[PDB]
Design an enzyme around this catalytic site. Structure first.
Site, PDB file in Angstrom:
ATOM      1  N   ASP A 112      27.617  40.491-131.913  1.00  0.00           N
ATOM      2  CA  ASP A 112      25.995  40.084-132.257  1.00  0.00           C
ATOM      3  C   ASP A 112      25.872  39.567-133.762  1.00  0.00           C
ATOM      4  OD1 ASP A 112      25.441  40.907-129.642  1.00  0.00           O
ATOM      5  OD2 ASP A 112      23.909  42.715-130.399  1.00  0.00           O
ATOM      6  N   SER A 157      19.527  37.566-119.913  1.00  0.00           N
ATOM      7  CA  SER A 157      19.783  38.710-119.113  1.00  0.00           C
ATOM      8  C   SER A 157      21.307  39.065-119.079  1.00  0.00           C
ATOM      9  CB  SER A 157      19.226  38.430-117.793  1.00  0.00           C
ATOM     10  OG  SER A 157      17.795  38.299-117.558  1.00  0.00           O
TER      11      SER A 157
HETATM   12 MG   LIG Z   1      22.664  44.117-131.162  1.00  0.00          MG
END
Ligand SMILES: [Mg+2]
Ligand SMILES: CC(=O)c1cccc(NC(=O)C(F)(F)F)c1
Ligand SMILES: [Cl-]
Ligand SMILES: [Cl-]
Ligand SMILES: [Cl-]
Ligand SMILES: [Cl-]
Ligand SMILES: [Cl-]
Length: 348
Positions: A164, A33
């Site tokens: 990411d 989260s």
């Molecule tokens: Mg991403």
């Protein structure tokens, strides 16, 4: 140790240092989260991620340690960095929760390619910054594995950060059908016909650069096979020299069923593009991964003459990834992670 305070936000307990104020939910994947917050020590708007189930299995405990090790290493202007990492636990015996703090990102490259009129100068600067960050990542022998527009943050001054990293997290379901999760992936790994190597990230850069030039996805396949047929129509079927290197029986068997096709003329596909952009695309979008341009070679291509500075394209400190081949118990991965939380030193 700072003082911590507790609050419930969308059914989750958040226990954080008093320095982080105005917490408000932004998102939640299956990995954790995220809340936006104001950091009163630095004056930055930040993202605070609470990991979910970080030590639930050996696979999950090792992935937690992997992510923390990677984010602690990355110190470059065009790569996301770690501002802070904390746990409310006062000892290894009560350790359960890990929170990661980064700069809050607004727009991604999806936003700016869908909406804005890009000049050739904007494409030069955005692709330059991706390649500057990739030179640094690859110098540490790190593969990103998941470069795509949603993983590239861009500010109002056209300044770009990579985020990411692929943590080996994507599922077969996530890669199925008409999905952006697959459109940027190199062919030789779409069906795992080649062991992963850093050259797959340069394929992804070529797909992203094509889409900034045209405003359209380059290879928007409806499934893995449709996508391979779009790729081979542009770059041609494998030649004899790149069949001799393809060891995978599965690959040669499907490949050799297809009618042979030549490489297309890229000036007739990318109509009106800068000839130097066309040339660089021809050097990235090569089927034989051994023959693709590298990030360090691409920075010296004439397309980037206005931005290239070989005295301001830094490499990374050495990165020890020997843990990737090591067999440990959940509590051993958990103790290693704990050590990495308590040894964290914040940036200047
Ligand atoms: Mg991403
Ligand atoms: C060494 C190397 O460049 C390599 C290794 C295995 C497979 C492929 N590519 C293909 O099989 C495909 F492009 F046709 F999909 C390339
Ligand atoms: Cl505090
Ligand atoms: Cl950063
Ligand atoms: Cl805890
Ligand atoms: Cl995307
Ligand atoms: Cl290291």
């Amino acid at each position: 140790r700072p003082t911590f305070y507790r609050q419930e936000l969308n059914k989750t307990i958040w226990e954080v240092p008093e320095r982080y104020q105005n917490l408000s939910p932004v998102g939640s994947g299956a990995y954790g989260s995220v809340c936006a917050a104001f950091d009163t020590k630095t004056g930055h708007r930040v993202a605070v991620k609470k990991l979910s189930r970080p030590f639930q299995s050996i696979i999950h405990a090792k992935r937690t340690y992997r992510e923390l090790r990677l984010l602690k290493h990355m110190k470059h202007e065009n790569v996301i960095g770690l501002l802070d990492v904390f746990t409310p636990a006062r000892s290894l015996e009560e350790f359960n929760d890990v929170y990661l703090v980064t700069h809050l990102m607004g727009a991604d490259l999806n936003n700016i390619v869908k909406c804005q009129k890009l000049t050739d100068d904007h494409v030069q600067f955005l692709i330059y910054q991706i390649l500057r960050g990739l030179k640094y990542i690859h110098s540490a022998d790190i593969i990103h594995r998941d470069l795509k527009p949603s993983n590239l943050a861009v500010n109002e001054d056209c300044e770009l950060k990579i985020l990411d990293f692929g943590l080996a997290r994507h599922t077969d379901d996530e890669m199925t059908g008409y999905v952006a999760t697959r459109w940027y992936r190199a062919p030789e790994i779409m069906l795992n016909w080649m062991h992963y190597n850093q050259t797959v990230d340069i394929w992804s850069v070529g797909c992203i650069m094509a889409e900034l030039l045209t405003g359209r996805t380059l290879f928007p396949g409806t499934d893995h096979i449709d996508q391979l047929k779009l790729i081979l129509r542009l770059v041609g079927t494998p030649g004899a020299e790149l069949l001799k290197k393809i060891s995978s029986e599965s690959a040669r068997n499907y490949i050799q069923s297809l009618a042979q096709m030549p490489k297309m003329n890229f000036a007739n596909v990318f109509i009106g593009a800068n000839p130097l952009a066309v040339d660089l695309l021809e050097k990235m979008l090569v089927l034989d991964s051994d023959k693709r341009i590298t990030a360090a070679q691409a920075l010296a291509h004439a397309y980037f003459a206005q931005y290239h500075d070989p005295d301001d394209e830094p490499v990374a400190d050495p990165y020890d990834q020997s843990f990737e081949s090591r067999d440990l118990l959940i509590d051993e991965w958990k103790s290693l992670t704990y050590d990495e939380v308590i040894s964290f030193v914040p940036p200047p």
